[PDB]
Write a protein that binds this ligand. Structure first.
Ligand SMILES: Cc1cc2nc3c(=O)[nH]c(=O)nc-3n(C[C@H](O)[C@H](O)[C@H](O)COP(=O)(O)OP(=O)(O)OC[C@H]3O[C@@H](n4cnc5c(N)ncnc54)[C@H](O)[C@@H]3O)c2cc1C
Ligand SMILES: Cc1cc2nc3c(=O)[nH]c(=O)nc-3n(C[C@H](O)[C@H](O)[C@H](O)COP(=O)(O)OP(=O)(O)OC[C@H]3O[C@@H](n4cnc5c(N)ncnc54)[C@H](O)[C@@H]3O)c2cc1C
Ligand SMILES: Cc1cc2nc3c(=O)[nH]c(=O)nc-3n(C[C@H](O)[C@H](O)[C@H](O)COP(=O)(O)OP(=O)(O)OC[C@H]3O[C@@H](n4cnc5c(N)ncnc54)[C@H](O)[C@@H]3O)c2cc1C
Ligand SMILES: O=C(O)CCC(=O)C(=O)O
Ligand SMILES: O=C(O)CCC(=O)C(=O)O
Ligand SMILES: O=C(O)CCC(=O)C(=O)O
Ligand SMILES: [Zn+2]
Ligand SMILES: [Zn+2]
Ligand SMILES: [Zn+2]
Ligand SMILES: [Zn+2]
Ligand SMILES: [Zn+2]
Ligand SMILES: [Zn+2]
Lengths: 594, 594, 594
């Protein structure tokens, strides 16, 4: 009965269908979203969708295009897209950065190539995608002028493959350079230096013995290898292939069983037997610190390739919205939801769903035959739901935590991160004679040139993670850095500062890593995003605690009479867009054939 | 080496001194704070204190009264006391509630009688204390007119006792009635009904088998009994006495060893082998839900007696502040801290400590010989500290989480919670003839009279916990309810609403439990406290995750050259005032005899 | 010595012969019963057979046809066939149901297609067989007009197969619909509804956690899968094939060893670790309740195909009896049995067997050379046996329990179970205008149309199991329902009621499931069978308790000097006819070649 549950969860995880068939639901979603859409088996239905983030838009588009009467209620008054949010200049208000060409991501910023549906959907919309440099690169290497590789998916069904165009064999990502920084414990090296000799940064973390000699990267990878062995095999090639479907699924089932009880921290301590100092170091270097006490699965799931969308992530939501001007109602917030499930405004023969919204944050009533709720559970918590959902669904709405996240963006007049030392001499002397020599004397609070292209630097200071844009905005001399990106307590302290203080601290921190002298190129333009203070999100992502997945995720996905659910949290890919998209499709399929 | 650490932690927990002596540090603190103060072994020193919450005030008072030159830097511009915060009318601004006599607690509200130092300190200041009714009472029982019992502490040193006055044998707390509500899963009973037959509320939680038959109270107690047996023994009397010092300390040491690896949730699931449904129920009814994933110790530690201070909790901080008008600098926020530890503004023979503050949130520099930092670690995180603290102290500042907490207070023109049904007829008909009959017809959204005195009601809805004042404010007809008190995700959603929406939702929720008809007595006055948005707190309390205590708490308490630390987080009584007070004294003792 | 016993028991279970050969005794029985009969190796013998149920008739026919002098003594005065009993109209007495064409089964009603010998024997007698709908079907699907599939058996001997005619490839059973009812805990759904969402009925059973999400069907199947794996393998096809003979037999041997110690209840609780609530639910839904405390094997053994015999089950016994008019003595009950086993009326050179009967329930003496006793052990218990049987045989007669079973049959003037709602309007308005509208208002004791064809409904009320006839009797408008079929305590209470009260309660119960309005079509004709009060049965079946099989079943089958044994109980297929038939043949083979 437990084994039965683990099997069911693994199917959820791996997108596998019921037993007499074992379908590749990745193929079904691709087909439907991309190739064919939906065909209604009978008359169009009235359908209501709450939330005009990516999940609500995707399902809205599919159900509209198949001929259904769709209404999309979005609490936000001026913005669709939810946790897809770009700071961009818009005609009629001042530009978010001094240079009005500049833009930057408030929310989602990178898309994995092991995430097909979202990449397929971007291509289908004829949006242009480029490589997101998660590690800093050599930009006089690779071939990015060649066409973007088509989406290429391989099924477990054997020989079944899905693509959306012809190969691009001459396309090639740039070499990773790893010239960016690790600054922990008042020590500082380049990622490449750490890789060749990790003791430098490890002694600062007070790792001793055989740990000192190992990178945090290798530690985490080795730790996970036995886990991986449950559903796959490292061949003599040194490569990894999934086992046969049965032993591959039972394996993932046995992963659920043996490891959902753990947090990442307890896994590293207890299973991989690492020192508290190693876990400390792993957390800081590998962005795990604040999620160590949360489910191992959250960290476990998520040289791979990442993608950004020319013009910012917003293009994906906004493009979809163009097809749905007629269906999208902005500035309406669901406060009540009533539905009729055989086994006041609803009933037999009357409408089966009734939603009531209020303006912004008047009292409209909306009715229909079926519903999709795509709003985060944080926000669902404060909606009055007339017949309660199932016990475990209600528990899921109560118990699912959302992590705080804040981003802090600083515009620079130049892309100082690229500069060689020589570049710094040129670029400072250009502002005033002697300015190089000045910053050279003055020095720092108790730095060599970064000379990096994309990627980011990692630190223990509150900024934590600093990302450089992967691609320059055509024709501009400057760029926007993600100066601070932090979670949990840090975020909350970032939030409670004044704009000036927050941008001051973010710059002091950037300066601690990069040099005082970066101050000269700051334009005084900064933007902040505080996902906790977002009324319609209250965080970045649904992050589960140990055993939560096991105890109620199968109830998260279930319909509730005529009410269906989609969104990032509905999937087992928490913190990603694919999950919201996979589940939008899934939802859309379901309400179509009801 | 592990056993050695567990022993040391248990001494920290139990306030036991080093081995060749094994002193009762509760006796030392009482003596010093209450009876004698401190005697400096040599010349007075310059001492700087950061934070004018309870810890900074207590140590400020002790060190000033012993003759030292103390300065207290408090970032807040108009308010001392920190997480001790009362909403009270103050001459010159409008009253926080329509009735200007009314007040209510934003922060700390109740003091345990198993917490001597703070109770002793309230008596020593000649502040008046009354019983805090954590469970609702029969108010025609007990004797509270008799003198307040003196603080009476018993040491483990054998026959050593501490009191601050003569006995009060005729003083007697009121009988617990338990007429207040449990409203979970759209079901509702009185605590007393649950106690006699818990199946009603338990089936709503889908507890089955032998759990259905048991109260959550009894489940938690039984669960903890074996743990308790490690350092104590349940005698045939049915009572519990601590074992002999050695087996009592080794026991607490073995508690640290065997259980710090757990969260409360994992303890209940894995150790006490409870169903996920029972843990669900336990969490909701026993206020554990949001802290299930945090350390078992946090929940484990904290028919016992509680105390409130006539005039509000603020009296304790504010009274202390009167003695320290000359030492307290308001509106100054530490941004930098520099110190000289043999083994710029500081050095040998120069001053040993230098702090720099900024106005509110100009750049003053403050120097001295020794320092106490009593600010929460959330706030310490963003202070520049010139020689870094020890590695594990820095890790503690980084890794110690603070929980979000929000309180929502609603003034009522009458104390409807007291009313019998008859009282409701009288009190509504008084507003307009027929008004009783009206609310009787109209009814509810799909309630009997509460008729309770003090205590609170517990629910699954976002309010979660609703507390009724224990004592009426003399001469007033109304009262302030704590309508909503919530943590984690709930708090963050509460926070992001508008005052009107927040007070609207809080009242709808109160009405779901108590009756629609309570609406009539609402005065439209409400106050909110959002401890996450407090720049100087960023939460209620330092709450540790599993193993954190084991890995770095011994480093939390250590001095850092001439820098000492006190405050709620410095102790192993997280979430209480005693801990901040015990550690203020401890700190004060230490800097005195340096 | 234990392993030796388990091996021997598995051979018994699987019909495998001794080691130097390992014959398929299914092939021997088919050959003998069906193709060839028996050839006596020497002169015909005098043979006496007790009991003219299926086992006594089968062996009587074989031994008569091979030329032996057979006498069959049947205690019953007017009826052969034993637990094969049909209520049918017979010229000269009133019809059992108002419509004299109607008939129904008192005893055995369905024959599995995994039971070859009995199906072969029905074909050989040129009796017509049709599908027994154990689950309700879609009757506008399948092909039953095609010839009945021939009996097709596959041996473990490899490539050895047995059939009794040419294939019928166009014959095809109807699709299962599952529109019949589950009514448990005052809740009611269609089997198909339970299958798609089992929580409805499961919450009524107070299953929680991961059980709530699973059907009782899937639970039982999964539970048994590891057991199955002992002697077979689930191939990647998702199908199941027996392992190689040696590992297949050792496997069944290891099944005997590891699981005969269990009851079904203790298996589900202890081995499959199910909640007492799940076992409750499993018992009620899957007809196991009253046999949970009996051997796991009983339940373990017994989408498969079932057969009924046109004209009722009686045809099989009665047809056989026609060939044996000369051998069958009716109305004689064995009271004494005397026999001469070298190592009064019997002795050396005298006759070797002597039986004494009494009329009905005069004192005839019957002699002969060999005997077969086919009477149930309940009845054998009260027979005086001159030289005692072996100790363990005597223990088997004492200790083998027979389960009480009662059937209650109610004739209806129409087959209301078939009806759509529309059909009900038509069929009630036909009795009197408004009658539909009447029952619609009046309603029920605190029901939708069944609209089902064959199968049955399952409930917790005393009826327990209600079966609808699979095929209409040609030319009739009505039908007989098996309204109540119950075991153990229920049966005994059914029994002690008056005909009118029993038929009243059975109808109230039917009405609780199906609708009050079914009352109109009741003809006031009902029949009861109480197998406990049957003097010649005293129950339905020999049902073993845990370990009984292990301790004495090898002694059950052994001859006792010239006395052989056959019948349902002699086999390891307790509760079936095949077992009585397999053992009749086995017996007949043995006495032939003595
Ligand atoms: C800082 C950050 C960075 C991220 N980076 C990445 C990344 O690099 N790669 C990646 O793959 N994913 C990333 N993600 C995750 C990704 O952005 C989300 O998982 C995804 O956008 C989920 O969309 P959704 O439709 O499920 O929900 P949302 O985007 O939350 O949409 C919900 C919508 O509901 C509306 N709404 C809420 N309540 C109501 C109400 N009561 N009535 C009406 N409307 C309401 C909201 O206004 C909103 O538009 C990131 C997320 C964050 C926060
Ligand atoms: C909602 C709530 C309810 C509670 N209820 C209870 C209860 O019922 N019983 C109980 O025993 N305990 C309770 N507590 C806990 C108790 O209130 C605290 O543990 C206690 O007040 C701790 O005081 P402290 O001196 O350690 O810190 P704080 O009270 O946090 O004082 C720190 C001070 O430092 C100042 N400061 C911060 N940063 C700077 C800076 N950079 N420069 C200068 N000054 C700075 C702040 O303004 C503040 O005045 C509760 C707490 C909360 C939040
Ligand atoms: C309610 C019910 C439903 C069943 N349904 C099915 C089914 O669907 N499918 C299936 O395969 N099996 C079914 N069975 C089982 C099947 O009916 C029996 O296992 C089978 O009929 C066994 O026959 P038998 O020859 O072993 O014994 P019996 O049928 O018991 O024959 C024994 C004979 O011995 C006679 N007798 C008894 N004592 C004496 C005496 N002292 N002297 C002389 N004669 C005596 C009796 O009168 C009787 O005729 C069912 C049984 C019952 C009770
Ligand atoms: O961009 C990042 O590094 C984090 C954003 C996120 O939530 C994710 O990548 O899954
Ligand atoms: O008043 C309460 O219930 C909670 C306040 C708190 O933090 C505590 O009691 O320790
Ligand atoms: O018909 C039934 O369901 C029960 C009869 C029986 O004893 C059997 O099927 O083995
Ligand atoms: Zn925009
Ligand atoms: Zn180019
Ligand atoms: Zn004040
Ligand atoms: Zn009085
Ligand atoms: Zn007959
Ligand atoms: Zn036909």
């Amino acid at each position: 009965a437990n084994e039965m549950t683990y099997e069911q969860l693994a199917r959820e995880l791996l997108l596998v269908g019921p037993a007499p068939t074992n379908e590749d639901l990745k193929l079904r979603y691709l087909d439907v979203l991309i190739d064919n859409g939906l065909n209604p088996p009978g008359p169009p239905k009235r359908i209501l969708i709450v939330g005009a983030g990516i999940a609500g838009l995707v399902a809205g588009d599919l159900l509209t295009r198949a001929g259904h009467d769709v209404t999309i209620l979005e609490a936000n008054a001026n913005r669709v897209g939810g946790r897809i949010k770009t700071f961009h200049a818009k005609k009629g208000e001042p530009s978010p950065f001094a240079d009005p060409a500049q833009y930057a991501e408030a929310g989602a910023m990178r898309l994995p190539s092991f995430h097909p549906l979202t990449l397929a959907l971007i291509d289908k919309l004829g949006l242009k995608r480029r490589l997101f440099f998660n590690v800093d690169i050599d930009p006089q290497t690779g071939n990015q002028d060649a066409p973007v590789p088509p989406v290429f998916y391989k099924s477990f069904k054997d020989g079944k493959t899905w693509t959306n165009g012809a190969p691009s064999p001459e396309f090639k990502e740039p070499d990773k350079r790893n010239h960016t920084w690790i600054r922990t414990n008042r020590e500082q090296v380049r990622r490449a230096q750490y890789a060749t000799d990790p003791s430098s940064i490890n002694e600062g973390f007070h790792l001793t013995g055989c740990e000192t000699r190992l990178t945090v990267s290798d530690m985490v990878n080795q730790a996970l290898e036995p886990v991986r062995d449950y559903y796959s095999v490292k061949q003599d090639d040194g490569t990894r292939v999934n086992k046969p479907f049965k032993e591959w699924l039972a394996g993932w089932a046995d992963v659920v069983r043996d490891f959902d009880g753990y947090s990442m921290g307890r896994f590293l301590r207890e299973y991989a037997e690492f020192s508290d100092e190693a876990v400390e170091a792993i957390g800081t270097i590998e962005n795990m610190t604040s999620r160590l006490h949360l489910a191992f699965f959250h960290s476990f799931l998520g040289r791979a390739t990442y993608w950004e969308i020319e013009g910012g992530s917003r293009m994906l939501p906004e493009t979809l919205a163009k097809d749905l001007r007629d269906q999208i109602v902005m500035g309406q917030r669901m406060v009540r939801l009533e539905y009729y499930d055989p086994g006041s405004l609803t009933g037999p023969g009357g409408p089966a769903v009734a939603i009531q919204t209020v303006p912004e944050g008047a009292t409209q009533t909306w009715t229909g035959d079926l519903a999709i709720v795509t709003i985060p559970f944080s926000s669902l918590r404060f909606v009055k739901v007339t017949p309660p959902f199932s016990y475990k669904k209600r528990r899921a709405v109560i118990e699912t935590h959302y992590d705080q996240a804040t981003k802090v963006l600083l515009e620079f007049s130049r892309r100082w991160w690229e500069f060689t030392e020589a570049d710094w001499k040129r670029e400072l002397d250009a502002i005033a004679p002697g300015l190089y020599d000045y910053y050279q004397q003055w020095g720092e609070d108790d730095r060599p040139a970064t000379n990096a292209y994309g990627g980011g630097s990692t630190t223990d200071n509150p900024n934590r993670f600093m990302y450089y844009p992967s691609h320059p905005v055509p024709g501009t001399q400057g760029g926007v850095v993600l100066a601070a990106y932090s979670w949990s307590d840090d975020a909350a302290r970032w939030d409670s500062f004044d704009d000036a203080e927050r941008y001051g601290y973010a710059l002091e921190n950037l300066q601690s890593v990069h040099g005082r002298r970066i101050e000269v190129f700051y334009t005084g333009a900064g933007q902040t995003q505080s996902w906790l203070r977002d009324p319609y999100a209250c965080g970045e992502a649904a992050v589960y605690t140990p055993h939560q997945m096991t105890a109620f995720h199968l109830d998260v996905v279930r319909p509730e009479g005529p009410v269906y659910f989609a969104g990032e949290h509905v999937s087992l890919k928490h913190a990603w867009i694919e999950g919201a998209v996979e589940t939008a499709v899934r939802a859309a399929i379901a309400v179509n054939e009801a």
